[PDB]
Copies of this chain bind each other. A is one copy, B any other.
Amino acid sequence: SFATRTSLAADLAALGLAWGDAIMVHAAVSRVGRLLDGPDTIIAALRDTVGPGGTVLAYADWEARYEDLVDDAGRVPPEWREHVPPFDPQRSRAIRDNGVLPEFLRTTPGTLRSGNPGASLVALGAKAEWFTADHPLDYGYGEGSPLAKLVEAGGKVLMLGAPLDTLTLLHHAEHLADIPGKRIKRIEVPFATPTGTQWRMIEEFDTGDPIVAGLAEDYFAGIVTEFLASGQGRQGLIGAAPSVLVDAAAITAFGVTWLEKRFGTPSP
């Protein structure tokens, strides 16, 4: 009844994960079933399937409880400024909303973590340095971001039993979409540096809610559901977890088209 490193690797190959792939994972680890090495079995199986030339990624974000204290400008009151732990890509935890897997991947030796805290990705493998280098601090889900690099490299996204609305790459589609009324987030962020804490205003399209008004919180799940119903992507079990594997470029373009058909003015 134990799911092993070998058995999960076989499930991953059966679903379409291939040697050399760059694979970003969204997991609901409890749905995989009985795991012999806990969540680390999932990470190992992904690395076994993808080989030393591939890369395993996950969405990290970070635990910034201090955001409950910021004013309407997104700035930290002076009374709290020196009590807020600054972001350090090597020490700051992955956000707890994203599950156990991003944090377990972050603390796997060799894993790198990009520099934009809220948009940070973790990467482990051959192109981890490229994925995590020079993450732009403003609009960190757009051009030059790890998500943009995942599309460029022909990477893939694996929903390992996770709800389909957690597909972070669709925030990149939100950034690219040519639509009016895009919601913007501004937040002050402290960065750990060799000379001490540096504070910096971060501006981006807001990813805590849909990019524009008139959308349900989980409307990403609808985009993926329509994507799968249209015959794109792959479906199958990884352990006990029903899973979907999609092409990063395909789901991004589908998401942009989806948004621009509904709120934009598309071509034909």
Residue A262 lies at the interface, judged by CB distance under 8 Å to chain B: no
Residue A109 lies at the interface, judged by CB distance under 8 Å to chain B: yes
Return chain B residues, CB-CB under 8 Å to A83: 2, 4-6, 36
- The contact string, 1 if C-beta is below 8 Å from chain B, for chain A 62-86, is 0101100100000000000001110
Interface size on A, residues (CB 8 A): 26
Residue A225 lies at the interface, judged by CB distance under 8 Å to chain B: no
Chain B: minimal CB distance from A106 (Å): 8
Residue A93 lies at the interface, judged by CB distance under 8 Å to chain B: yes
Residue A30 lies at the interface, judged by CB distance under 8 Å to chain B: no
Please report the C-alpha to C-alpha distance between residue A91 and residue B90 in the assembled complex, in whole angstroms.
16
Please report the C-alpha to C-alpha distance between residue A2 and residue B83 in the assembled complex, in whole angstroms.
10
Please report the C-alpha to C-alpha distance between residue A44 and residue B93 in the assembled complex, in whole angstroms.
14
Q: A91-B108, A109-B91 are in contact. Are A84 and B36 (CB under 8 A)?
A: yes
Q: Would you list the 4 A-B pairs with minimal beta carbon distance, nearest first?
A: A37-B85, A107-B107, A4-B83, A36-B65
13 residue pairs from A and B, CB less than 8 Å apart: A2-B69, A5-B83, A5-B85, A6-B83, A34-B65, A36-B66, A36-B83, A37-B63, A37-B65, A38-B93, A44-B85, A90-B109, A107-B107
